[PDB]
Design a binder for this molecule. Structure first.
Ligand SMILES: O=C(O)CNC(=O)C(=O)O
Ligand SMILES: [Mg+2]
Ligand code: NI
Ligand SMILES: [Zn+2]
Length: 331
């Protein structure tokens, strides 16, 4: 078995190997990349996502989210307080202000230490989940606005045509903005490109060990666990690397820099934080190997997780027994 320790793998495709997206994902899996839950892909030196980022300031962040923490430094939840709309140029100025800017630091490890020590004492503002794309239409390779859709993959594998569309989302971050422990909707893959700015640090649990993370989470967030049998779908819980190590949970970490892609694999729990002002683009995708994960994905039916239009067909076709209860939670 390839990659039996479930290490995060880093790939350097040539421009020739960068032509066929599906083929390269399948290659990475042939080398065991999925066992980690996360891989990094450094694009060939000839590739670019677009010519410049000089003209993005007028994008609107209609609902910036202030991420308010509760708990202890290594075990906390966050809630999202909606703020008034602002442009990307306004948000960048705010990220660089004395109140919100990255502190002085020696290196990524020192900054990681400072994040886990001090995150809970601040409430950074995240421009998350904005429908749109920064890939130039003329970028032919790994253009996250031109990937094959999940509905087309399901139809190709299973023969059933379904409603729904599959589009990318932009994330404008600042120091200490945080993504909570989660897997993707329906345990899909995700791909994330860091277009510009400061880094993003990721933590990930191998898919074969995801249930160990879930059992710890139920212990650490006992009221939330009684409320819902899949409360990690709410995307609000944080657990530090130190707490994971104390509880013997297998995980890995890596820092993504501007110009690099990350892929998360089905049922790969992940969490992380931004180092300073940045912009990422991400989308979900599927492969033939996903179908079995989609059929077994947990679901929130308490009402909290509330998701997209396109998830309805996935539940309805892959999980018909769960459909009625899940839909009640959606409505
Ligand atoms: O970048 C973020 O805030 C969160 N991204 C992801 O969870 C992802 O790309 O799957
Ligand atoms: Mg603009
Ligand atoms: Ni994700
Ligand atoms: Zn729930």
């Amino acid at each position: 078995a390839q990659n039996p320790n479930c290490n995060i793998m880093i790939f350097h495709p040539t421009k020739e190997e960068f032509n066929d997206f599906d083929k390269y994902i399948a290659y990475m899996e042939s080398q065991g990349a999925h066992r980690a839950g996360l891989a990094k892909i450094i694009p060939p030196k000839e590739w670019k996502a677009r010519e410049t980022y000089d003209n993005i300031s007028e994008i609107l962040i209609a609902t910036p989210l202030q991420q308010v923490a509760s708990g202890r430094a290594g075990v906390f939840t966050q809630y999202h307080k909606k703020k008034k709309a602002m442009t990307v140029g306004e948000y960048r100025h705010l990220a660089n202000s004395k109140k919100y800017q990255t502190p002085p630091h020696q290196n990524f490890e020192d900054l990681e230490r400072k994040y886990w020590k001090n995150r809970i004492y601040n409430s950074p503002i995240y421009g998350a989940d904005i429908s749109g794309s920064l890939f130039d239409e003329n970028t032919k390779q790994w253009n996250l606005g031109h990937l094959g859709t999940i509905q087309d993959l399901l139809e190709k594998e299973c023969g059933v045509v379904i409603e729904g569309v599959n589009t990318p989302y932009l994330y404008f971050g600042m120091w200490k903005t945080t993504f909570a422990w989660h897997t993707e909707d329906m345990d899909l893959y995700s791909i994330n490109y860091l277009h510009l700015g400061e880094p993003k640090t990721w933590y990930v649990v191998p898919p074969e060990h995801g249930q160990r993370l879930e059992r710890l989470a139920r212990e650490l967030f006992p009221g939330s666990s009684r409320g819902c049998g899949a409360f990690l779908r709410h995307k609000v819980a944080l657990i530090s690397p130190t707490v994971l190590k104390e509880n013997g949970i297998p995980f890995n970490r890596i820092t993504q820099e501007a110009g690099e892609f990350m892929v998360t694999f089905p049922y790969g729990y992940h969490a992380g934080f931004n180092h300073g002002f940045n912009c990422a683009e991400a989308i979900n995708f599927a492969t033939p190997r996903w179908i079995d994960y989609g059929k077994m994905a947990s679901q929130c039916s308490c009402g909290e997780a509330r998701v997209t239009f396109s998830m309805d067909a996935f539940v309805r076709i892959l999980q018909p027994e769960r459909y009625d209860l899940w839909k009640r939670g959606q409505d």
